[PDB]
Design a protein around this nucleic acid. Sequence first.
DNA 1: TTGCTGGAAAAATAG
DNA 2: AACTATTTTTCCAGC
Length: 284
Amino acid sequence: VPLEWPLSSQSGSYELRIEVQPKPHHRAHYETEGSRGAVKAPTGGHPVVQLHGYMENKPLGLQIFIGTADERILKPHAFYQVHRITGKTVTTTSYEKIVGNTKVLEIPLEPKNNMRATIDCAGILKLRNADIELRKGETDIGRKNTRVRLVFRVHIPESSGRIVSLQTASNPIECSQRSAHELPMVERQDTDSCLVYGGQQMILTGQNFTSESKVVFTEKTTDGQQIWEMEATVDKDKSQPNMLFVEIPEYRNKHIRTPVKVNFYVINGKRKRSQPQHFTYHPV
DNA sequence: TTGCTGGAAAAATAG
DNA sequence: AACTATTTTTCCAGC
């Protein structure tokens, strides 16, 4: 049986259920990196998959593979591979095999555990778009294609010769590291140019502007060179919520004969930095 | 050393 | 070719 085939959750007395859905969020790890864990449950544990209606007494194999996010087109995702985790914290044995270009990871579904299984041994590896897209015949695009689904399936051998094949897909999971949390970001400036002298006040409205927010003007080179840094004084004596009043600093060289492009950003901590804002100093 | 990550800087890209 | 604005990969540091 193919991985693309539209199997179903149930089939008469049989029914594959995802007792515990994974978290909506899970950062995948790259080859050039160390494992980033197994998919975790929103609670704190991990996902749980169970087969209902298996009165038989023989352990079955539960397959796991990462697939696309759209239900209508459950396909294994071309830019992600299930990753087999192992060792101490991993209460579930597991073997892996390749099927097509897909890594599939099998887990045991045991009658003694009521065909109930804990998926704490499956992590997610991220392939490089470039590498995948060079594969002849593939047309899926990687860029911005970071949602995926954990796809579970099992093959039920009926003593009557034929096998019932079931499958269940988890809720989508976001695999791209969400970078910000408590970051401050400018959305509206007030002034974007000024004379080398500065002294002019610039109003800045954005998000997450704390009582200890700072504004730093910087100048680079076309080769990304930090040739100028300079903190701007921010009227903290008073201010509206998410609105910072900045005093444009004087440009290092008041003798420039042509306008110079420069950047400024907002900082709340040694690592809490906004996106680089644009500014221009004009020769007097 | 294994994982295992959080946080990021460095490297790539789309327009 | 070079820019910016965004995304993706690689690195680094702390267990």
